[PDB]
Amino acid sequence: LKVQVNSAAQAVGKVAGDISPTLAGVLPSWLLAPSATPPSEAAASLPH
């Protein structure tokens, strides 16, 4: 069965190829990126 069905799956893939693995989870370079600007606490009018 690992011989005949794989030869049958290779035969189907030659006649009709598979669909491409489309990508919907492509994110920009932000959602894993820290905001490197200092917060409003560091710019406050109080010595730390």
Place this chain on the structure above:
Amino acid sequence: IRDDGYRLWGNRTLSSDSKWAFVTRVRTMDLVMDAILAGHKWAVDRGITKTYVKDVTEGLRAFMRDLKNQGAVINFEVYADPDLNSASQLAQGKVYWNIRFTDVPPAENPNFRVEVTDQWLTEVL
């Protein structure tokens, strides 16, 4: 400037005067003097009695010290105008107050004079 899209860079405005070069000189000029007015909208009525000139001259001093404590300005002075205030134009409705504040400078160019020592001087050289 940096990383192609990451941050803006530059704060000086298109100004011919070096006094008004920064936008923070211009923004804090107009956004305290319309925040002065917001809250002190009663200064266009309640006609000029003896306490009225005295009512807002620490009405502004108590509001601008709230600007000073939150860092919006550094030390200021608010006082009624001694010479231009007169009874000839107080009946006209005009009455003057003098505002003098300096604002915080933005540190666009921090210099770092590094120096090393052990107790008081460079012991190596």
